[PDB]
Design an enzyme around this catalytic site. Structure first.
Site, short mmCIF file in Angstrom:
data_model
loop_
_atom_site.label_atom_id
_atom_site.label_comp_id
_atom_site.label_asym_id
_atom_site.label_seq_id
_atom_site.Cartn_x
_atom_site.Cartn_y
_atom_site.Cartn_z
N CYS A 182 2.45 5.56 -4.26
CA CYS A 182 1.80 6.79 -4.72
C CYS A 182 1.31 6.67 -6.14
CB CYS A 182 2.68 8.01 -4.53
SG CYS A 182 3.53 8.06 -2.94
N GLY A 210 6.55 3.87 -2.90
CA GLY A 210 6.30 3.55 -4.30
C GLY A 210 4.82 3.35 -4.61
N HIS A 266 4.26 15.18 -6.91
CA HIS A 266 5.51 14.98 -6.17
C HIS A 266 6.46 13.98 -6.85
CE1 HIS A 266 3.44 11.79 -3.64
NE2 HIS A 266 4.52 11.14 -4.06
C1 VEV Z 1 5.19 7.50 -3.44
C2 VEV Z 1 6.28 8.17 -2.65
C3 VEV Z 1 6.34 7.64 -1.24
O1 VEV Z 1 6.50 6.45 -1.05
N1 VEV Z 1 6.16 8.52 -0.21
C4 VEV Z 1 6.28 9.93 -0.39
C5 VEV Z 1 7.53 10.55 -0.30
C6 VEV Z 1 7.63 11.92 -0.43
C7 VEV Z 1 6.51 12.72 -0.65
C8 VEV Z 1 6.65 14.24 -0.72
C9 VEV Z 1 7.10 14.76 0.65
C10 VEV Z 1 5.32 14.93 -1.05
C11 VEV Z 1 7.68 14.67 -1.78
C12 VEV Z 1 5.27 12.09 -0.76
C13 VEV Z 1 5.15 10.71 -0.63
C14 VEV Z 1 5.90 7.97 1.15
C15 VEV Z 1 5.67 9.08 2.18
O2 VEV Z 1 4.59 9.66 2.27
N2 VEV Z 1 6.71 9.34 2.96
C16 VEV Z 1 6.70 10.42 3.93
C17 VEV Z 1 4.90 6.83 1.30
C18 VEV Z 1 5.17 5.77 2.15
C19 VEV Z 1 4.16 4.88 2.48
C20 VEV Z 1 2.90 5.08 1.95
N3 VEV Z 1 2.62 6.08 1.10
C21 VEV Z 1 3.61 6.91 0.78
#
Ligand code: VEV
Ligand code: VEV
Lengths: 304, 304
Positions: free
Chosen positions: A145, A143, A41
């Site tokens: 991830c 951030g 992602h």
């Molecule tokens: C590392 C990115 C991030 O912080 N995310 C995130 C955002 C988007 C996605 C997709 C939908 C798969 C494109 C994945 C992960 C956060 C998240 O999950 N937001 C919904 C995140 C926030 C807090 C903790 N982990 C991840």
């Protein structure tokens, strides 16, 4: 004496963390040998998240679109591929700090340490368990991830988790290092609910053995039970069923304390039925389930 | 989201751990620059422990009596001195992995990470707090002495603790890196009882702010209180008195959540008086006090 929620020393994993940027998205990568592993992602933009077609999104990406920075120095990306939900970025330089490693897929109830990172830099280390519903209750911000979960056996790091996302309930979902999610979760911004977060019975028993070893014995009762009688109570309290395999792995703790596994089950059964009555066990007012029998033996024996 | 008991990444400290042997006693040492710091009780034999005269015991020791091993290689000891309860062994080689460092003496209530080691090898990392009675509730077995406690500010490691002993109650005592014990404890096998282990009020409040930030809000009440009214209840529950200095350091958490510090004090006062009623806050059934306001801000902001 003393029993703590302890993480593995994180140094070997700190030496593997890098920053991966694709377009305007920046997350963490794991650099082992000449490959950087990161959540696929990273290729998703501001709104792609809703219904991404990763194969299609990846067609618009070339090696030069993935920016990998290790410390304050840039790595040259000479190849890229998608394996399930992870991207593998081949770089022209082997990580000089690559520890001995394995990729393992853990079972629910198994514990691991997480090195939480932001921008390829480590912020903290904590101990987790893969929940029976395949979520983890971590501490991850935007951030984070690409931060990884691991266990260490002397000098060999077994990587078992890579952080991908946070579900709408604030619990976490991720993959093994082959990119396969734990549980039914998918890397898309869609409402995905977790199943029942049951208690890891074998881990609670292991922790009750740890408490006996450390002098906390008030809860030891005058009863015994059978696996079938115990499991009727365990099901009622949303505890995972205990199998003979769990009894077998608790054997060393049973031997060290002289408390039969089924006697400890009966003490646990009474704790479930009577509550703690305002008392604590190893400084906790609830039954801890994020220590495996192996963790209790390791901590109580001082394995390095 | 999510809030975990998190330790600092331990890599910088792992690079400093060595094994120190004197006679038949082996413990851990901290190698910074060309000096190895270790508990002076490494010079004590099978029974010396009862009433050791360290100056006298040290007269019988020469540089060659201290064996320092870093990894599987021996370091040459070219000098030795006693500073309070620590020995400083000058070696002929500066530790190539010496991080930027400071020696600090922490106050009670302050938290730190401990890298538990055995035979100069790291076994695990966990987060502690210096208790108001100057003990720490660690996880230390025989041979763990010399393991250190530290905090990290970006790239600078501030060493604040060195493990020396376990009291008859299973709680731990140690020194700062200048060899001065925290509390009234002495390095001798004599019964030394700890004082009241009161709860670190400012840390509980910080953790209640962490819970609000993470969605755990059930405990938020419709009341407020004053410092004087709150402290009357705090004294009754063996909580440390809250000062205006504590209110000042909770200001950023008050601002982020919009909950006045005195309103959070009133919610805490109600939790003390009514109990948790079988409910949990951040997965805990008791009020957590081993997170400082700084730790909550750091974890909730992702400082690396
Ligand atoms: C590392 C990115 C991030 O912080 N995310 C995130 C955002 C988007 C996605 C997709 C939908 C798969 C494109 C994945 C992960 C956060 C998240 O999950 N937001 C919904 C995140 C926030 C807090 C903790 N982990 C991840
Ligand atoms: C590192 C030594 C050790 O394990 N000790 C220990 C033994 C003796 C002494 C003196 C009395 C000062 C000579 C100090 C420390 C253990 C201990 O404290 N035993 C009483 C120890 C066990 C468990 C945890 N920490 C230390």
């Amino acid at each position: 004496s003393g029993f703590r929620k302890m993480a593995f020393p994180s140094g070997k994993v700190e030496g593997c963390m890098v920053q991966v940027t694709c377009g305007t998205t920046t997350l963490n990568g794991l650099w082992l040998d000449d490959v950087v592993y990161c959540p696929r992602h990273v290729i998703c933009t501001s709104e792609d998240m809703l219904n991404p077609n990763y194969e299609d999104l990846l067609i618009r990406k070339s090696n030069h679109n993935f920016l990998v920075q290790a410390g304050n120095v840039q790595l040259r990306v000479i190849g890229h591929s998608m394996q399930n939900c992870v991207l593998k970025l081949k770089v022209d330089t082997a990580n000089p700090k690559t520890p001995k490693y394995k990729f393992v897929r853990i079972q629910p109830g198994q514990t691991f340490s997480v090195l939480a990172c932001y921008n390829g830099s480590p912020s903290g280390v904590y101990q987790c368990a893969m929940r029976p519903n395949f979520t983890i209750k971590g501490s991850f911000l935007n951030g984070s991830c690409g931060s990884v979960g691991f266990n260490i056996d002397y000098d060999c790091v077994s990587f078992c988790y890579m952080h991908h996302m946070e579900l709408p309930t604030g619990v976490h979902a991720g993959t093994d290092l082959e990119g396969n999610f734990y549980g039914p979760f998918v890397d898309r911004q869609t409402a995905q609910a977790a199943g029942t977060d049951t208690t890891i019975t074998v881990n609670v028993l292991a922790w009750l053995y740890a408490a006996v070893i450390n002098g906390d014995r008030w809860f030891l009762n005058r009863f015994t039970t059978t696996l079938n009688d115990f499991n009727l109570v365990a099901m009622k309290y949303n505890y995972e069923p205990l199998t003979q395999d769990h009894v077998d792995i608790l054997g060393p703790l049973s031997a060290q304390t002289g408390i039969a596994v089924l006697d400890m089950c009966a003490s646990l059964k009474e704790l479930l039925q009577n509550g703690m009555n305002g008392r604590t066990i190893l400084g906790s007012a609830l039954l801890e389930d994020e220590f495996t029998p192996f963790d209790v033996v390791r901590q109580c024996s001082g394995v390095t």
